[PDB]
Amino acid sequence: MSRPRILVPGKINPRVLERLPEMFETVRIERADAALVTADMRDVSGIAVSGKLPVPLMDAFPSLEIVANFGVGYDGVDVSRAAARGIVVTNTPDVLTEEVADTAIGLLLNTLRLLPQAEQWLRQGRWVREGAFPLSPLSLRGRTVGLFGLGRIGLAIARRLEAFGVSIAYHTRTPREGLGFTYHPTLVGMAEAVDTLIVIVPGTASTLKAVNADVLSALGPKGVLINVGRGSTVDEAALVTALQNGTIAGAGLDVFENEPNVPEALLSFPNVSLLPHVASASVVTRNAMSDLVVDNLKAWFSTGEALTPVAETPFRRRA
Amino acid sequence: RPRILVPGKINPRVLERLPEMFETVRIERADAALVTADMRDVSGIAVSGKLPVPLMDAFPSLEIVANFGVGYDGVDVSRAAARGIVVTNTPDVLTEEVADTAIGLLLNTLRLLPQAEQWLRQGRWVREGAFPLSPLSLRGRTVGLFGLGRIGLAIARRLEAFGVSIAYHTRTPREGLGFTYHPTLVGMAEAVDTLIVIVPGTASTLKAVNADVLSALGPKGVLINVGRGSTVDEAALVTALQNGTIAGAGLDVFENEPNVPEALLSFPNVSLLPHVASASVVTRNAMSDLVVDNLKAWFSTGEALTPVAETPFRRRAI
Ligand SMILES: NC(=O)c1ccc[n+]([C@@H]2O[C@H](COP(=O)([O-])OP(=O)(O)OC[C@H]3O[C@@H](n4cnc5c(N)ncnc54)[C@H](OP(=O)(O)O)[C@@H]3O)[C@@H](O)[C@H]2O)c1
Ligand SMILES: NC(=O)c1ccc[n+]([C@@H]2O[C@H](COP(=O)([O-])OP(=O)(O)OC[C@H]3O[C@@H](n4cnc5c(N)ncnc54)[C@H](OP(=O)(O)O)[C@@H]3O)[C@@H](O)[C@H]2O)c1
Ligand code: NA
Ligand code: NA
């Protein structure tokens, strides 16, 4: 009744750890690994986690009620298996929307105008010896942007893009009514129509390698791909080929198939910007994400209703 | 065919198009000592950057200086006006491009994206894990625009979509816009935490961003300069960054380009670009076209396309 025990496997923002003592006992393990679970941990009622939650770790806890996922994406939790056990899963929507949308525009501008490379040119002393940084072959001016995904974050990206004077289209499974953006019922169809593709869908079975050779070919030789969603959504091998052959003109990636590993071939290109999954990674936004993780757990145990349960687990607490 | 002097470096598109109507005369530096007796019939100049007065005054038949760039502080416009010489610039065709760079630089300064990319490229994501969280963010910021002209307004339009508060300082307020006007720069700096400089480099803006303005901007303060480097007291900025008087800075322009002081290079909270705000192929092509089309319009019709405010002149031949 009094204090529930919460497991935290691996690294998490210290703000989560700082706030859990408001209601909970915290149990830490150094890695998300079932082999680290001891007999004394079998009474754990909740998990707070960033990234992967292996099924054998989740299933090591007979009294588990709730997984509070740090992040709006929760593809590291086996939600099917959670639902089958009656375990509620919560995520962190909304509190990071604007931050992520800001990073998406930054990455887009860096990709098109080569601003990081320009800064390196200056910092390495090349402005003095060799003169002006080369003119960027690309620009945002005159571009047509297609958003793959138009949810919380996709719409926030579209709102920014409206102020840059570019045409905007989108592809989702179901159109969003009331908005003045051109809907495309197929991804490849949108890709044909646009020269700039921004990926902001979840990493599910339905989006797995959706950005493939055909979509990239359709995007075309002025084509720029921006991925701020999940790396699984892009066929990473096909992207490398497309960049090698000049099938597309450039790419900016915050996410990858097998993080933190980025293939050497992607690192070679002068027309590519790469970030280590930083789209929400400010102090203020990660603090808000931490707060929402903890407030989800507090709401669950005190009222029986989570703040932001995921669609797959619209559960209420039975105790 | 009028003879056009081009001193020093210019976009090859200018040089490609001048033969449509003109004879081109090249000198390798903007230096009067390189002018020969044969060049004394030159009717026009096309120039990027500085045009020294002794070079300008080496040409008795000079009619027009077509400046490459919307900024024309490298031309002595007072002396040009006193000789009846029209000066043209390249407004409008670079406005959106420059506004794009201003936002890019702002985001890079706040979120440390270039440094995050370096962390990845140097193999640190694999060995040491996540790039450190950026202490700063755009979220919750209040932006003050020093200058709100063609480019300043285009920047404000972008910022409106980022959900930040917007204020501005100009000598005269702009009516009809919903942004908070400040009659003094220091007053705006007190009210905001993010200062974007987009004024021309004139006597009136010279070191306007000084120790007092930076102190007023405050310890969460971020300075972005995409105007001219002369507008910022570069020495005072270095001191302010050293002392923690402000939180960060993003600079596209500097007091003595291409030289950037070593102290500015040292800071982890600073983004630096080599004057790239308009430097795309498409935008520089449009700037080149406008330089040439100004000269063509002047010599064919007697009316320039984009003369500067100081020289609202029409051609008198002979
Ligand atoms: N880089 C980062 O650090 C970072 C940060 C935050 C989020 N993210 C990623 O961004 C994702 C989206 O976040 P959000 O808050 O915007 O979520 P959201 O509000 O649920 O939006 C998801 C969008 O994707 C669309 N979608 C899903 N499956 C689709 C499919 N198979 N085909 C076409 N459209 C599809 C949805 O429309 P329909 O359902 O109608 O198809 C919806 O428009 C997260 O799941 C996360 O993986 C990454
Ligand atoms: N980094 C780059 O590559 C790059 C590219 C393009 C332009 N620029 C620079 O940006 C400048 C602005 O371009 P623009 O097309 O926006 O020019 P603009 O349309 O003439 O706008 C200039 C703005 O500055 C204000 N201003 C001028 N002197 C001022 C003073 N002493 N105090 C306060 N406000 C002052 C003007 O308002 P008031 O007259 O009412 O004071 C006006 O709002 C250029 O002159 C150039 O130096 C740099
Ligand atoms: Na296309
Ligand atoms: Na302030």
Side-chain angles (χ1 to χ4, degrees), chain B residues 271-305:
Chain B
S271 181
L272 303 166
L273 294 169
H275 204 155
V276 307
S278 71
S280 70
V281 172
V282 67
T283 297
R284 290 291 177 89
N285 277 344
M287 292 161 69
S288 308
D289 285 337
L290 186 49
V291 168
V292 176
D293 292 346
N294 267 295
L295 294 169
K296 291 182 79 181
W298 180 260
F299 286 104
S300 67
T301 73
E303 185 166 24
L305 298 179

mmCIF file of all heavy atoms in Angstrom, chain B residues 271-305:
data_model
loop_
_atom_site.group_PDB
_atom_site.id
_atom_site.type_symbol
_atom_site.label_atom_id
_atom_site.label_comp_id
_atom_site.label_asym_id
_atom_site.label_seq_id
_atom_site.Cartn_x
_atom_site.Cartn_y
_atom_site.Cartn_z
ATOM 1 N N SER B 271 28.834 29.551 -32.113
ATOM 2 C CA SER B 271 28.833 29.083 -33.499
ATOM 3 C C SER B 271 29.359 30.175 -34.438
ATOM 4 O O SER B 271 28.959 31.322 -34.349
ATOM 5 C CB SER B 271 27.436 28.638 -33.928
ATOM 6 O OG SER B 271 27.458 28.154 -35.266
ATOM 7 N N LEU B 272 30.235 29.790 -35.358
ATOM 8 C CA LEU B 272 30.911 30.717 -36.247
ATOM 9 C C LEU B 272 30.774 30.260 -37.689
ATOM 10 O O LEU B 272 31.050 29.102 -38.005
ATOM 11 C CB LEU B 272 32.395 30.783 -35.884
ATOM 12 C CG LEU B 272 32.710 31.175 -34.434
ATOM 13 C CD1 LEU B 272 34.152 30.869 -34.117
ATOM 14 C CD2 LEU B 272 32.400 32.633 -34.184
ATOM 15 N N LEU B 273 30.370 31.182 -38.557
ATOM 16 C CA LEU B 273 30.251 30.907 -39.991
ATOM 17 C C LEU B 273 31.017 31.965 -40.793
ATOM 18 O O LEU B 273 31.026 33.134 -40.403
ATOM 19 C CB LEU B 273 28.778 30.929 -40.420
ATOM 20 C CG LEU B 273 27.842 29.851 -39.866
ATOM 21 C CD1 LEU B 273 26.402 30.209 -40.197
ATOM 22 C CD2 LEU B 273 28.198 28.484 -40.433
ATOM 23 N N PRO B 274 31.631 31.572 -41.932
ATOM 24 C CA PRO B 274 32.430 32.482 -42.760
ATOM 25 C C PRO B 274 31.613 33.337 -43.737
ATOM 26 O O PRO B 274 31.796 33.244 -44.959
ATOM 27 C CB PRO B 274 33.384 31.518 -43.488
ATOM 28 C CG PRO B 274 32.598 30.282 -43.644
ATOM 29 C CD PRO B 274 31.713 30.182 -42.432
ATOM 30 N N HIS B 275 30.726 34.170 -43.192
ATOM 31 C CA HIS B 275 29.888 35.077 -43.953
ATOM 32 C C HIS B 275 29.116 34.362 -45.062
ATOM 33 O O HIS B 275 29.248 34.690 -46.234
ATOM 34 C CB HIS B 275 30.748 36.245 -44.472
ATOM 35 C CG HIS B 275 29.973 37.491 -44.755
ATOM 36 N ND1 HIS B 275 30.542 38.748 -44.742
ATOM 37 C CD2 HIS B 275 28.678 37.674 -45.092
ATOM 38 C CE1 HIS B 275 29.630 39.647 -45.069
ATOM 39 N NE2 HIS B 275 28.486 39.019 -45.275
ATOM 40 N N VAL B 276 28.315 33.371 -44.667
ATOM 41 C CA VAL B 276 27.607 32.507 -45.618
ATOM 42 C C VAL B 276 26.109 32.770 -45.767
ATOM 43 O O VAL B 276 25.430 32.026 -46.492
ATOM 44 C CB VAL B 276 27.801 30.997 -45.304
ATOM 45 C CG1 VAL B 276 29.272 30.652 -45.196
ATOM 46 C CG2 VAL B 276 27.054 30.568 -44.034
ATOM 47 N N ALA B 277 25.575 33.817 -45.149
ATOM 48 C CA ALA B 277 24.119 33.940 -45.096
ATOM 49 C C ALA B 277 23.376 33.896 -46.440
ATOM 50 O O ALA B 277 22.256 33.374 -46.478
ATOM 51 C CB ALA B 277 23.679 35.128 -44.253
ATOM 52 N N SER B 278 23.974 34.412 -47.516
ATOM 53 C CA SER B 278 23.376 34.327 -48.865
ATOM 54 C C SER B 278 24.060 33.317 -49.796
ATOM 55 O O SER B 278 23.706 33.222 -50.967
ATOM 56 C CB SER B 278 23.361 35.704 -49.543
ATOM 57 O OG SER B 278 24.656 36.111 -49.897
ATOM 58 N N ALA B 279 24.995 32.542 -49.273
ATOM 59 C CA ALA B 279 25.973 31.823 -50.090
ATOM 60 C C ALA B 279 25.517 30.456 -50.607
ATOM 61 O O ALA B 279 26.210 29.445 -50.432
ATOM 62 C CB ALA B 279 27.289 31.707 -49.337
ATOM 63 N N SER B 280 24.347 30.425 -51.244
ATOM 64 C CA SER B 280 23.909 29.273 -52.046
ATOM 65 C C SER B 280 24.167 29.610 -53.518
ATOM 66 O O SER B 280 24.173 30.798 -53.911
ATOM 67 C CB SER B 280 22.427 28.946 -51.813
ATOM 68 O OG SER B 280 21.552 29.939 -52.367
ATOM 69 N N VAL B 281 24.305 28.572 -54.334
ATOM 70 C CA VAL B 281 24.388 28.746 -55.803
ATOM 71 C C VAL B 281 23.191 29.534 -56.348
ATOM 72 O O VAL B 281 23.379 30.543 -57.060
ATOM 73 C CB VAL B 281 24.572 27.393 -56.541
ATOM 74 C CG1 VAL B 281 24.462 27.540 -58.064
ATOM 75 C CG2 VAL B 281 25.937 26.809 -56.214
ATOM 76 N N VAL B 282 21.969 29.098 -56.038
ATOM 77 C CA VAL B 282 20.770 29.766 -56.609
ATOM 78 C C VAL B 282 20.691 31.254 -56.204
ATOM 79 O O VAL B 282 20.390 32.105 -57.031
ATOM 80 C CB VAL B 282 19.450 29.000 -56.283
ATOM 81 C CG1 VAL B 282 19.111 29.040 -54.793
ATOM 82 C CG2 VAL B 282 18.282 29.543 -57.118
ATOM 83 N N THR B 283 20.994 31.572 -54.946
ATOM 84 C CA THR B 283 20.867 32.952 -54.462
ATOM 85 C C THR B 283 21.985 33.855 -54.962
ATOM 86 O O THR B 283 21.737 34.999 -55.336
ATOM 87 C CB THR B 283 20.712 33.017 -52.921
ATOM 88 O OG1 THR B 283 19.490 32.336 -52.554
ATOM 89 C CG2 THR B 283 20.633 34.448 -52.416
ATOM 90 N N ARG B 284 23.204 33.329 -55.015
ATOM 91 C CA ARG B 284 24.312 34.088 -55.594
ATOM 92 C C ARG B 284 24.153 34.291 -57.106
ATOM 93 O O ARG B 284 24.552 35.338 -57.628
ATOM 94 C CB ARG B 284 25.665 33.470 -55.254
ATOM 95 C CG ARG B 284 26.032 33.615 -53.778
ATOM 96 C CD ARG B 284 26.322 35.048 -53.382
ATOM 97 N NE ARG B 284 26.612 35.199 -51.960
ATOM 98 C CZ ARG B 284 27.829 35.100 -51.402
ATOM 99 N NH1 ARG B 284 28.898 34.817 -52.113
ATOM 100 N NH2 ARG B 284 27.969 35.283 -50.094
ATOM 101 N N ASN B 285 23.560 33.313 -57.788
ATOM 102 C CA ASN B 285 23.180 33.490 -59.187
ATOM 103 C C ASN B 285 22.175 34.630 -59.376
ATOM 104 O O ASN B 285 22.332 35.428 -60.293
ATOM 105 C CB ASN B 285 22.622 32.198 -59.783
ATOM 106 C CG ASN B 285 23.712 31.244 -60.256
ATOM 107 O OD1 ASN B 285 24.863 31.621 -60.414
ATOM 108 N ND2 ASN B 285 23.332 30.017 -60.516
ATOM 109 N N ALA B 286 21.172 34.705 -58.503
ATOM 110 C CA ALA B 286 20.176 35.802 -58.525
ATOM 111 C C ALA B 286 20.799 37.158 -58.212
ATOM 112 O O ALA B 286 20.470 38.167 -58.858
ATOM 113 C CB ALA B 286 19.040 35.505 -57.564
ATOM 114 N N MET B 287 21.731 37.186 -57.261
ATOM 115 C CA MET B 287 22.494 38.413 -56.957
ATOM 116 C C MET B 287 23.347 38.871 -58.132
ATOM 117 O O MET B 287 23.338 40.063 -58.478
ATOM 118 C CB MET B 287 23.367 38.235 -55.709
ATOM 119 C CG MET B 287 22.546 38.105 -54.436
ATOM 120 S SD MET B 287 23.442 37.388 -53.061
ATOM 121 C CE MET B 287 24.605 38.700 -52.694
ATOM 122 N N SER B 288 24.048 37.931 -58.769
ATOM 123 C CA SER B 288 24.806 38.216 -59.983
ATOM 124 C C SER B 288 23.935 38.791 -61.103
ATOM 125 O O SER B 288 24.326 39.760 -61.770
ATOM 126 C CB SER B 288 25.499 36.951 -60.492
ATOM 127 O OG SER B 288 26.250 36.322 -59.481
ATOM 128 N N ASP B 289 22.773 38.168 -61.322
ATOM 129 C CA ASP B 289 21.843 38.621 -62.345
ATOM 130 C C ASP B 289 21.400 40.055 -62.083
ATOM 131 O O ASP B 289 21.361 40.868 -63.005
ATOM 132 C CB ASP B 289 20.615 37.690 -62.478
ATOM 133 C CG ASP B 289 20.926 36.380 -63.180
ATOM 134 O OD1 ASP B 289 21.917 36.285 -63.950
ATOM 135 O OD2 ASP B 289 20.164 35.414 -62.978
ATOM 136 N N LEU B 290 21.107 40.386 -60.828
ATOM 137 C CA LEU B 290 20.633 41.728 -60.472
ATOM 138 C C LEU B 290 21.731 42.798 -60.635
ATOM 139 O O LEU B 290 21.430 43.912 -61.081
ATOM 140 C CB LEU B 290 20.019 41.741 -59.065
ATOM 141 C CG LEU B 290 19.350 43.042 -58.575
ATOM 142 C CD1 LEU B 290 18.362 43.651 -59.566
ATOM 143 C CD2 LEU B 290 18.651 42.771 -57.260
ATOM 144 N N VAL B 291 22.985 42.462 -60.321
ATOM 145 C CA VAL B 291 24.133 43.359 -60.609
ATOM 146 C C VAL B 291 24.207 43.702 -62.104
ATOM 147 O O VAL B 291 24.216 44.880 -62.481
ATOM 148 C CB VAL B 291 25.485 42.751 -60.153
ATOM 149 C CG1 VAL B 291 26.678 43.525 -60.714
ATOM 150 C CG2 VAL B 291 25.573 42.729 -58.644
ATOM 151 N N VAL B 292 24.183 42.668 -62.943
ATOM 152 C CA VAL B 292 24.251 42.856 -64.388
ATOM 153 C C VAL B 292 23.001 43.570 -64.932
ATOM 154 O O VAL B 292 23.121 44.490 -65.741
ATOM 155 C CB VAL B 292 24.520 41.525 -65.133
ATOM 156 C CG1 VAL B 292 24.500 41.723 -66.643
ATOM 157 C CG2 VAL B 292 25.872 40.972 -64.702
ATOM 158 N N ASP B 293 21.819 43.166 -64.474
ATOM 159 C CA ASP B 293 20.573 43.756 -64.968
ATOM 160 C C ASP B 293 20.451 45.236 -64.565
ATOM 161 O O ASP B 293 19.892 46.015 -65.319
ATOM 162 C CB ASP B 293 19.339 42.954 -64.522
ATOM 163 C CG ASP B 293 19.253 41.561 -65.165
ATOM 164 O OD1 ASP B 293 19.961 41.272 -66.146
ATOM 165 O OD2 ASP B 293 18.462 40.732 -64.671
ATOM 166 N N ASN B 294 20.986 45.618 -63.404
ATOM 167 C CA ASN B 294 21.120 47.036 -63.028
ATOM 168 C C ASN B 294 21.953 47.840 -64.031
ATOM 169 O O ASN B 294 21.541 48.913 -64.473
ATOM 170 C CB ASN B 294 21.729 47.188 -61.629
ATOM 171 C CG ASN B 294 20.671 47.289 -60.552
ATOM 172 O OD1 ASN B 294 19.899 48.258 -60.525
ATOM 173 N ND2 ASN B 294 20.614 46.299 -59.672
ATOM 174 N N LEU B 295 23.124 47.319 -64.372
ATOM 175 C CA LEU B 295 24.001 47.964 -65.358
ATOM 176 C C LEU B 295 23.335 48.040 -66.742
ATOM 177 O O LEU B 295 23.357 49.103 -67.386
ATOM 178 C CB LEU B 295 25.331 47.221 -65.456
ATOM 179 C CG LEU B 295 26.242 47.241 -64.233
ATOM 180 C CD1 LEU B 295 27.379 46.239 -64.435
ATOM 181 C CD2 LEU B 295 26.769 48.648 -63.973
ATOM 182 N N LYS B 296 22.709 46.947 -67.178
ATOM 183 C CA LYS B 296 21.986 46.931 -68.467
ATOM 184 C C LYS B 296 20.844 47.942 -68.491
ATOM 185 O O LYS B 296 20.671 48.669 -69.472
ATOM 186 C CB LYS B 296 21.442 45.537 -68.796
ATOM 187 C CG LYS B 296 22.506 44.510 -69.131
ATOM 188 C CD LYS B 296 21.912 43.160 -69.508
ATOM 189 C CE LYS B 296 21.397 43.153 -70.930
ATOM 190 N NZ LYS B 296 20.789 41.847 -71.288
ATOM 191 N N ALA B 297 20.062 47.979 -67.415
ATOM 192 C CA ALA B 297 18.953 48.949 -67.321
ATOM 193 C C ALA B 297 19.450 50.395 -67.368
ATOM 194 O O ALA B 297 18.889 51.230 -68.089
ATOM 195 C CB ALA B 297 18.118 48.688 -66.080
ATOM 196 N N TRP B 298 20.514 50.684 -66.620
ATOM 197 C CA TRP B 298 21.123 52.031 -66.579
ATOM 198 C C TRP B 298 21.582 52.511 -67.946
ATOM 199 O O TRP B 298 21.220 53.607 -68.378
ATOM 200 C CB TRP B 298 22.318 52.059 -65.608
ATOM 201 C CG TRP B 298 23.004 53.396 -65.511
ATOM 202 C CD1 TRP B 298 24.162 53.770 -66.129
ATOM 203 C CD2 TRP B 298 22.560 54.535 -64.774
ATOM 204 N NE1 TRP B 298 24.475 55.064 -65.812
ATOM 205 C CE2 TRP B 298 23.505 55.565 -64.987
ATOM 206 C CE3 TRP B 298 21.446 54.799 -63.960
ATOM 207 C CZ2 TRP B 298 23.385 56.825 -64.399
ATOM 208 C CZ3 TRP B 298 21.320 56.067 -63.391
ATOM 209 C CH2 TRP B 298 22.291 57.053 -63.600
ATOM 210 N N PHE B 299 22.373 51.693 -68.625
ATOM 211 C CA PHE B 299 22.919 52.094 -69.904
ATOM 212 C C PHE B 299 21.881 52.053 -71.040
ATOM 213 O O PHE B 299 21.968 52.878 -71.947
ATOM 214 C CB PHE B 299 24.198 51.314 -70.226
ATOM 215 C CG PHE B 299 25.387 51.767 -69.413
ATOM 216 C CD1 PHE B 299 25.853 51.027 -68.345
ATOM 217 C CD2 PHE B 299 26.008 52.978 -69.697
ATOM 218 C CE1 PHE B 299 26.939 51.459 -67.587
ATOM 219 C CE2 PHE B 299 27.094 53.409 -68.949
ATOM 220 C CZ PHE B 299 27.561 52.648 -67.892
ATOM 221 N N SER B 300 20.867 51.184 -70.961
ATOM 222 C CA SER B 300 19.840 51.110 -72.029
ATOM 223 C C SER B 300 18.638 52.065 -71.851
ATOM 224 O O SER B 300 18.109 52.592 -72.841
ATOM 225 C CB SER B 300 19.355 49.673 -72.223
ATOM 226 O OG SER B 300 18.640 49.211 -71.099
ATOM 227 N N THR B 301 18.199 52.277 -70.611
ATOM 228 C CA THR B 301 17.010 53.110 -70.315
ATOM 229 C C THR B 301 17.308 54.388 -69.517
ATOM 230 O O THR B 301 16.469 55.280 -69.472
ATOM 231 C CB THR B 301 15.919 52.319 -69.543
ATOM 232 O OG1 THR B 301 16.329 52.099 -68.186
ATOM 233 C CG2 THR B 301 15.603 50.979 -70.229
ATOM 234 N N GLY B 302 18.467 54.462 -68.864
ATOM 235 C CA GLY B 302 18.790 55.568 -67.958
ATOM 236 C C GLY B 302 18.230 55.465 -66.548
ATOM 237 O O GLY B 302 18.400 56.387 -65.742
ATOM 238 N N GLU B 303 17.576 54.347 -66.234
ATOM 239 C CA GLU B 303 16.998 54.112 -64.918
ATOM 240 C C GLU B 303 17.488 52.761 -64.406
ATOM 241 O O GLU B 303 17.267 51.736 -65.053
ATOM 242 C CB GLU B 303 15.466 54.117 -64.984
ATOM 243 C CG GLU B 303 14.774 53.994 -63.624
ATOM 244 C CD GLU B 303 13.294 54.335 -63.661
ATOM 245 O OE1 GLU B 303 12.652 54.247 -64.721
ATOM 246 O OE2 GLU B 303 12.765 54.717 -62.615
ATOM 247 N N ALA B 304 18.172 52.777 -63.261
ATOM 248 C CA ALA B 304 18.606 51.562 -62.589
ATOM 249 C C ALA B 304 17.403 50.795 -62.026
ATOM 250 O O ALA B 304 16.324 51.363 -61.845
ATOM 251 C CB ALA B 304 19.580 51.886 -61.461
ATOM 252 N N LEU B 305 17.599 49.512 -61.743
ATOM 253 C CA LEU B 305 16.523 48.679 -61.157
ATOM 254 C C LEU B 305 16.432 48.918 -59.649
ATOM 255 O O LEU B 305 15.345 49.151 -59.127
ATOM 256 C CB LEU B 305 16.737 47.197 -61.463
ATOM 257 C CG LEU B 305 16.729 46.770 -62.940
ATOM 258 C CD1 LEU B 305 16.978 45.274 -63.051
ATOM 259 C CD2 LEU B 305 15.437 47.129 -63.672
#
